[PDB]
């Protein structure tokens, strides 16, 4: 018919005949991502394949959630949907879902490792914050930003790939050998506290500090050891913070070995930053000042997305059409709250694919 199959390694991609010359570009928790040439659009696209998402309740929840958001969210700094199809003809035969999205050049692992100047470092962080603020205007808190799900293009544009974890999603998604999620997990999530919208700035602080140090800031050996790596660097938090913790978590945190931490001048010395740009705001001290406001254990004392966009290191590139863009209207008011059975998820996802 109008479909054809191509063997990509061990995965089998049954894509539309319009998508030719499929080539692998990355491996994720949901499956393999391929780059193709859309002969109809005469442009390069990216295709990822979801295999029986409904069969897993958590994957069904994410697949539907991300299908809904991918459609209605249109923004310069969030990856854009181009097509959605399934090769199966009926609801009973329904199996796989293919998402066609804008094709980017690489992920942040190539940019974090290379040596950047202040102009590109701040502009990439600005593009990140614009995407985060747009997601927040729709009521989505990402809580899962890491170099692996942030992609860039050779013209220095940045886009967020996924929409993170919901409130009920948990600490992590399915397995992948190319990512360690706990490194960028925020203290609120670690210690079982509630999380606010500024939880995403902790991820940004870890990513920004990684652009400067060229190594993982907080490399925990296990889930609860991640807290040790955080306090060893930033210092044991104040008693004001620990009072908000649940009893058992508080008992653990109180009886941890006390660490005084290091000042951000010792954590991020001037030598680790590039030469001070010709712009007055793009100084090594300004980038360190932004880090001192993001990498903060107490979310109550951490700055917000709007405050970071007004920070002198970021405010250089402020454009209201990018930061104060009109928020997207999500059609499903119970996007994250709905619970269904495996066959109810199957029919719910199938309808999103077909219209």
């Amino acid at each position: 018919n109008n479909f054809y199959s191509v063997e990509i390694g061990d995965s089998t991609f049954t894509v539309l005949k319009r998508y030719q010359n499929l080539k692998p570009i990355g491996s994720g928790a949901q499956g393999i991502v391929c780059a193709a040439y859309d002969a109809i659009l005469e442009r390069n696209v990216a295709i990822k394949k979801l295999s029986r998402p409904f069969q897993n309740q958590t994957h069904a929840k994410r697949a539907y959630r991300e299908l809904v958001l991918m459609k209605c969210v249109n923004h310069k700094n969030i990856i854009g949907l181009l097509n959605v199809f399934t090769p199966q003809k009926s609801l009973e035969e329904f199996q796989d879902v293919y998402i066609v999205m804008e094709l980017m050049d690489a992920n942040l692992c190539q940019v974090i490792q290379m040596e950047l100047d202040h102009e590109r470092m701040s502009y990439l962080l600005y593009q990140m914050l614009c995407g985060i603020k747009h997601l927040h205007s729709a009521g989505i808190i990402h809580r899962d930003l890491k170099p692996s799900n942030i992609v860039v293009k050779s013209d220095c544009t940045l886009k967020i790939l996924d929409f993170g974890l919901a409130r009920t999603a948990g600490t992590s998604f399915m397995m992948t050998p190319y990512v360690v999620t706990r490194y960028y997990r925020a203290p609120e999530v670690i210690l079982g506290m509630g999380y606010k919208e500024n939880v995403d700035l902790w991820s940004v602080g870890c990513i920004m500090g990684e652009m400067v140090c060229h190594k993982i800031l907080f490399p925990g050996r296990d889930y609860i050891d991640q807290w040790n790596k955080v306090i060893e660097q930033l210092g044991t938090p104040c008693p004001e913070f620990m009072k908000k913790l649940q009893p058992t978590v508080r008992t653990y945190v109180e009886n941890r070995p006390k660490y005084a931490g290091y000042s951000f001048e010792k954590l991020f010395p001037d030598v680790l930053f590039p030469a001070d740009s010709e712009h007055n705001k793009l100084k090594a001290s300004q980038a360190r000042d932004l880090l001192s406001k993001m990498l903060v254990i107490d979310a109550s004392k951490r700055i917000s997305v709007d405050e970071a966009l007004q920070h002198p290191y970021i405010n250089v590139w402020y454009d209201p059409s990018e930061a104060e863009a009109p928020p997207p209207k999500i059609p499903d008011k119970q996007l994250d709250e709905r619970e269904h059975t495996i066959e109810e998820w199957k029919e719910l996802i199938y309808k999103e694919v077909m219209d």
């Binding site: 690489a106 940019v111 502009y123 860039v152 220095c156």
Partner: peptide, 9 residues
Amino acid sequence: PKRPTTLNL
């Protein structure tokens, strides 16, 4: 200043 227009690799 103007936004950067190139990012190698």
